[PDB]
């Protein structure tokens, strides 16, 4: 199968990316030194070399030298090509303007140079994977630059993105409403579909299901690696009814703006706890249609589903998949939209998930991941627009952004654009 590029932006992207590439090395049995022990699958994410040392086909960018420096000196130092790890001199300071107008453009061209040199060295290219955070300067301002630049030079190629959408209540910053909304305004027209995830939801699942009281980002990012691994498994391992990268956008994006399918995964069970469970196909399948198992803390029952992609993994009997999916279609609580009778997309690969050494989650013989697109997510956008309106009403933090070469009206346009997004979701939630 053909290659796919991974672009990791900001502290969230870089830190999350390291978790992902630990899994890939384990799936293909690649040593952390880069040298495979003494096949055709890894070509999609790994580039060959005359020696036995394969090179990951990813690029890391961060305006702050601190985060990447840990990778550059860690046990994966020899895995990455030294020029891929791009580092700036000063952080964006949780400022959208800095990472998008003043300092973001100083290093944007350098990143493109490595993307082009890496994109040109593949006969075919499915698209780009992009990891970033709405609640940062680099992960929100610099990302918007790449989305725009990657839309012109490589237009009409897939651009999938996993994003850390701001949590409903918890918050590790103060300017999340301003920064998060601004990038959404610019990334709406320059992206295919965004796989939102909330740290609040992942923390809740970790304490609720994984049964560990004291998690950390090093733990959550490993869970986030699973959804990426299952999503991209079809591009590496053989299996009946393989799902390509470009198939997600067609199935999960009815309209250009409505491209926010929240992520879900199953089963998340601790090693000891799993011994008391059966893990049948319906069990894992029905575990993804409850508001207690979501990576974004939104209640699906509040809204309506309008598209769902199921990417089954491991030793799966598709007959059971057909039966399990049929049952979910005939439950009153589960509610799909009126104008989408055909609201599922199945995918199976014969490769059970791998367990990172010392990992928390168990060695499941079978797993499933869902990418449902639900109008209940409009609640999150409305809440974010509400928080944004509270601050900008008094003009409480704009002086930081204006001084960074950002026009005043951008905030006005940003909210108005999100206002239309709310109405667009509302109309889709009804029937004509």
């Amino acid at each position: 199968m053909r290659e796919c590029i991974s672009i990791h932006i900001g502290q969230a992207g870089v830190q999350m990316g390291n978790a992902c590439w630990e899994l890939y090395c384990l799936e293909h049995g690649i040593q952390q030194d880069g040298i495979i022990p003494d096949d055709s699958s890894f070509g999609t994410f790994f580039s060959e070399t005359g020696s036995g040392k394969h090179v990951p086909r990813a690029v890391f960018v961060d305006l702050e030298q601190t985060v990447i420096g840990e990778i550059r000196t860690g046990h994966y130092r020899s895995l990455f090509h030294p020029e891929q790890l791009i580092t700036g001199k000063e952080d964006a300071a949780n400022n959208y303007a800095r990472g998008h107008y003043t300092i973001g453009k100083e290093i944007v061209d350098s990143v493109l140079d490595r993307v082009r040199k890496m994109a040109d060295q593949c006969s075919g290219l499915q698209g780009f994977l992009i990891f970033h955070s709405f609640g940062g300067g680099t992960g929100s301002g610099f990302t918007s630059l790449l989305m725009e630049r990657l839309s012109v030079d490589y237009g009409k190629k897939s651009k999938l993105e996993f994003s850390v959408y701001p949590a409903p209540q918890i918050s590790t910053a103060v300017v999340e409403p301003y920064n998060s909304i601004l990038t959404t305004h610019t990334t709406l027209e320059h992206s295919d579909c965004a796989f939102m995830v909330d740290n609040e939801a992942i923390y809740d699942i970790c304490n609720r299901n994984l049964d560990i009281e004291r998690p950390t980002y090093t733990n959550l990012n490993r869970l986030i690696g699973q959804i990426v691994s299952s999503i991209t498994a079809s591009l590496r391992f053989d299996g009946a009814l393989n799902v390509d990268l470009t198939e997600f956008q067609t199935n999960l994006v009815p309209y250009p703006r409505i491209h926010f399918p929240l992520v879900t995964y199953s089963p998340i069970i601790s090693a000891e706890k799993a011994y008391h469970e059966q893990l049948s196909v319906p069990e894992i399948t029905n575990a993804c249609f409850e508001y207690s198992n979501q990576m974004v803390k939104c209640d699906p029952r509040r809204g309506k589903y309008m598209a769902c992609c199921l990417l089954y993994r491991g030793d799966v009997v598709p007959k059971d998949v057909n039966a399990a999916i049929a049952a979910i279609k005939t439950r009153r609580s589960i509610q799909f939209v009126d104008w989408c009778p055909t609201g599922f997309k199945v995918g199976i690969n014969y490769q059970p998930p791998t367990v990172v050494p010392g990992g928390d989650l168990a060695k499941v013989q079978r797993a499933v991941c869902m990418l449902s697109n639900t109008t209940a997510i409009a609640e999150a956008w409305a809440r974010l627009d509400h928080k944004f309106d509270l601050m900008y009403s008094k003009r409480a933090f704009v002086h930081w952004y204006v001084g960074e070469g950002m026009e005043e009206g951008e905030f006005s346009e940003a909210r108005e654009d999100m206002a239309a997004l709310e109405k667009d979701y509302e109309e889709v939630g009804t029937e004509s």
């Binding site: 199968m1 053909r2 053989d238 067609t250 057909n322 599922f344």
Partner: protein
Amino acid sequence: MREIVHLQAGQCGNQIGAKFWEVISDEHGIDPTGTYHGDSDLQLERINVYYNEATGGKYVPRAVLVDLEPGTMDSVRSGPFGQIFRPDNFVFGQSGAGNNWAKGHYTEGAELVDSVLDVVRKEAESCDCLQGFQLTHSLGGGTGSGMGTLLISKIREEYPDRIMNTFSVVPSPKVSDTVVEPYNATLSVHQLVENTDETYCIDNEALYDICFRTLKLTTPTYGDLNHLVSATMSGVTTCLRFPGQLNADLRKLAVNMVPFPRLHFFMPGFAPLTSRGSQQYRALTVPELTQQMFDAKNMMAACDPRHGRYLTVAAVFRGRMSMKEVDEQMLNVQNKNSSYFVEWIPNNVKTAVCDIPPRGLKMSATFIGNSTAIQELFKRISEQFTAMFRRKAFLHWYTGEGMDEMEFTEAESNMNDLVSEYQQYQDATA
């Protein structure tokens, strides 16, 4: 003599194709390497119907394998049985279709289609009498619909007279492995009705039912459903490969089973389908074999024949069978179920017997039925198509790949007329 060239497109097509040649190679005793090791001479007498030949006994099956991404084909090539195909036949692209019909029909299939004809023509001019083409694909997907319909249209232009039968997977009535199945299916039907001589509509849901209901084997889905399909299509082409008391042919069934040009969508059935453990508790005589063909329990289509009426029916028996029993039972079937057959056709059953049975059996029969109950299927697709299209559910993906919404209306209007035509033949004479 009466050569057939096989086409397989899409992920479903290749996998069905792959298990389609593992069965035929078993019937003719052909080793995976292409070396003949059979026991009966009849295998060689017509081995040229599917397999070409290269000095040293290497028999090359003229299949043409086409897909828009190397993924599935690489599996077939690395398969144990992948050493048989001519490497020049694999036609692989580098950007697969994302289940959108337009891409596999306008922007991406267009770039790759010219290469395929260059491989069909070589297999076409290497046959002394080319009977017709064979195609296996899926309507729901993008490659099996986009390029499959694009390719079937092209081969119709150059070979209008030759036969072209299609074994096609149809979207299931209630379950769906893709969201855009109505758009893709609706466009595909509008494009087959004008080009394909006969189509064998099948669906996984109905074929799943056979696995657990009449058989008792829950583990497999795709490794075995394809094998039931492969046996069915092999039965249809048996008369062209082995001697028979009443030899049949792709053209014989078309004439018998196609009253009008636009009514050519059948629904196959196969027997016997017994579990290994319950097989010893059953007789293998002709009467019982014929009973299960006409029951909706053993129909590889989701449509139940009871709701409609048969227009034409064809049976292709195999093995040493008494032709009197082969004929008395059909007269019995017609009279018992007189309400299931239209009056304006005096006789609705076509029979054909082949002396050599399928591997591992001494008796078999492939059912092919043209019933107006199949209109339910298109009616259902139209209900789903109009609902999504009523609000432009996904048209932006299709319009952006060189397409217009006017084509969707034409596909919906043409589909509506196919449903209406099938409905006219529910009334009785006068």
